[PDB]
Amino acid sequence: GDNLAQIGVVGLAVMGSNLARNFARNGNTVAVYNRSTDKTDKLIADHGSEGNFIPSATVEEFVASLEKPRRAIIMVQAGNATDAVINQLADAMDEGDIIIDGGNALYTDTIRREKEISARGLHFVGAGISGGEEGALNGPSIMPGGPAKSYESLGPLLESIAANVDGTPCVTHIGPDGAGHFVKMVHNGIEYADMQVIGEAYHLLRYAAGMQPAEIAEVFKEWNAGDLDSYLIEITAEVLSQVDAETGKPLIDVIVDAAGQKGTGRWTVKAALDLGIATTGIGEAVFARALSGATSQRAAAQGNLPAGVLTDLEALGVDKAQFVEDVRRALYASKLVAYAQGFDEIKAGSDENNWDVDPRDLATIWRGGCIIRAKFLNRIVEAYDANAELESLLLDPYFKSELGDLIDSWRRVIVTATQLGLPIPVFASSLSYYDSLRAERLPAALIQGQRDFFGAHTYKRIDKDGSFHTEWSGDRSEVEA
Amino acid sequence: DNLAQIGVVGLAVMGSNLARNFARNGNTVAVYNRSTDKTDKLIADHGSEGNFIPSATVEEFVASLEKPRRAIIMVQAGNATDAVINQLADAMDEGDIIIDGGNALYTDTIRREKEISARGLHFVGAGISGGEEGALNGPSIMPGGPAKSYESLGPLLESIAANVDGTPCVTHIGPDGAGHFVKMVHNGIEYADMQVIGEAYHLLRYAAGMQPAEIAEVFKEWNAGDLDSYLIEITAEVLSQVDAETGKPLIDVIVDAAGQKGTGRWTVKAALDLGIATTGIGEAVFARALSGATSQRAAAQGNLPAGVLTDLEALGVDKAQFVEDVRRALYASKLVAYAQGFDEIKAGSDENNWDVDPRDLATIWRGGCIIRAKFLNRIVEAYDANAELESLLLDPYFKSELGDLIDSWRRVIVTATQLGLPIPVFASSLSYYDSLRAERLPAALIQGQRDFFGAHTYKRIDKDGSFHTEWSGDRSEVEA
């Protein structure tokens, strides 16, 4: 009846609350539960006007106040807190019901949980939810994984709260089991890289070009008009514009430059290492966060490492404005490299786990409700639309056409930065990855040689299939392995 | 009597070679292998090398060991290793010693310690380097476990360990998984050492135009100086080898796909979760992953725009100043890799309660290991002078060297970029260096970005406490 809810949310911290309210604000009847009932009461009291909520003090009431097939969404801390609730819902649920973790869960746990829960006759969906607390309230990006029959009852509910971009719901069936939580973690990694490339551009503009932060804010606003158009560059301009009331100096000059990597960024570069994917952009970005928090080591390194002979833009004879454009092109290229790696990681996760994930879906639903939202994503959708089996976003004709006009600026940026001794982790590592991909012969041939010498590790040959070994200690003849 | 002092479980190449190491060094060695065919091949071929006491069952193997019983496990890492451990503990006496010598994950070793520690026994996780020739001819052995066990075990281990200037390349590392942890960091450092040699060889061949034969000759020249290493010495051989079938240099015929299928990745994962910037080892592992992506390489080869490129001739760069500039970029990039590697040891040591002495490692890595080089003595000296040295880069010797390395370092990154050649570790290392020097890093901006979109608080250089700016409202600042 109308006394039954279409969806329910277990765990009413700010995030679980915001998501329940979002379901209620878009005309869904929503059941809400929390072990400590005090939280439930505070939702009803302070936000009950936003729509039609059905509160329960027990798990068995919650499950009884839900229409069928029963959709419940868990929004408690990741790990053991989560498994607790999952077991409680299955004890109480009937066969054919759908259980959903919407918390930030390692995708390996999601596969374990999906096997066990499906075996118990139920249905398990792991659902990535970006946008933090704001997105959860006003429109997130939803990335759900589980049985495709479950998105049939779940899909239209999520399409009602999801961020909308040009009439299209920023949510779609990702693939089976852990695909959703996997793609959310890749998206958290591709954000560290986005924040890092912007940082690098800012650093080169402040210390090579001698631009104050208010003036750099203006340059980002103008770049936000072009191809780089993104929510992150938009807000970066707001931050650099800010002034500290107390001191009168730019707010950024009064913030301790120490940013922990205590987040998801490190899980992305780990699966990359496990799937054998060169994610140098996200890696360098995660590493750069670690280095910033080395307070004792930075204090001791300060002014104590030799710089070498350094020049400036004036002595090089470099026009400020030409250099600003060059940094913009270096930024763009480095973002492309980061994304090409991230989408490689997606394709490798998908093959390893037989997921059949469509990169087009991710590029489409990441246009709203998350921090990486940018017009840029549309060209990734188009690229895969033109060639499902594109071996790299770099090889898409549009992007390959762009690289043609980026490359010289990119090279000039790494050269100039070295000549002024300025930190450029992603810009420089992206160009090395680029020049690596385009090379006919890499120094791995010699690594194979070293390994065969010290460990009889074997090497393959260009002209003949199978493994081979040189009798290094012996006659230096070559034999089959 | 008629008892073995030490026993080896796992009679494949590592294990048979190890058992044969103990025997050749005049200990009596018990040998047992689940499948008995291997236990036979050993006695059949290498039984003449020393006194082996072979067993078909775990009971017989444990019956042949002198008390306190010492058995080394040399089998597949993972489920195969956890099984042999229970089979041993189910037959051993209180006070006996189980040693795992395989490439174990250090978190399983810490857990295996407490499981076995409980049952009255002692558990040792021992990193064994040097592959199969080192297992026979002299490995570096990095044992972690209870100190009171090294007393029984050390003298046996010192009898087979690689020996350098009369000092044995084995010593107690620290409690539980300390030994397996430093073995994993030694393997990560090995990838960086190999990658920097690659980058140099690449710039000598593609920027200077030297053929393999000539690169060999300049590598033996560098081996007389400060860079003396086993890796550079073998590199010159590899580079001199000619493939008989075609007549072209053997490395021109090798598929240039390394493959990161090793333990190099376990180092970066550990670094990532310990809050340590491992850009050298990281980029080294990344470069291996990239080399192996055949189909993406076939597709990108000749299809990505290079830009305008120059050569050394048009830059007016002298070949001889360039080859010495490359030598210094390699020396500095390797020094960055070692400093990050030793920061990971500090962190991992501090994360547990290990008190690991970095000096022991630089000392026992001088033999057995592929990374053995004269350079390690300088790391020992750096930590003798300052036990709390914040970075190897700051140790006065290393810092004095960097003074003379930095200008060549910058010219190499610059020249490589202008010739479109890939130099990942050389370039990652310089940004890390320039990061360490910077008074203000981009993390200040990142804190601002996070406070705006996630109310993720920030800190201030003047006042104390955490602060947030009402970005969506007044844009004022309110402590939280």
Numbering used by the authors:
A (entry chain A): 4 to 484
B (entry chain B): 5 to 484
Give the published text.
Cg6PGD eluted with a molecular weight of approximately 116.8 kDa, indicating that Cg6PGD exists as a dimer in solution. The CD consisted of α-helices exclusively and was associated with dimerization.
To characterize the conformational change between Cg6PGD_apo and Cg6PGD_NADP, we determined the crystal structures of both forms. To predict the substrate-binding site of Cg6PGD, similar structures (Gs6PGD and Ec6PGD) were used to perform alignments, which revealed that the Asn107, Ser133, Gly134, Gly135, Lys187, Asn191, Glu194, Tyr195, Lys265, Thr267, Arg292, Arg454, and His460 residues were involved in the binding to substrate in Cg6PGD. Docking simulations of the substrate were also performed to predict the substrate-binding mode. The 6PG molecule fitted the substrate-binding cavity well, which was predicted based on other similar structure.
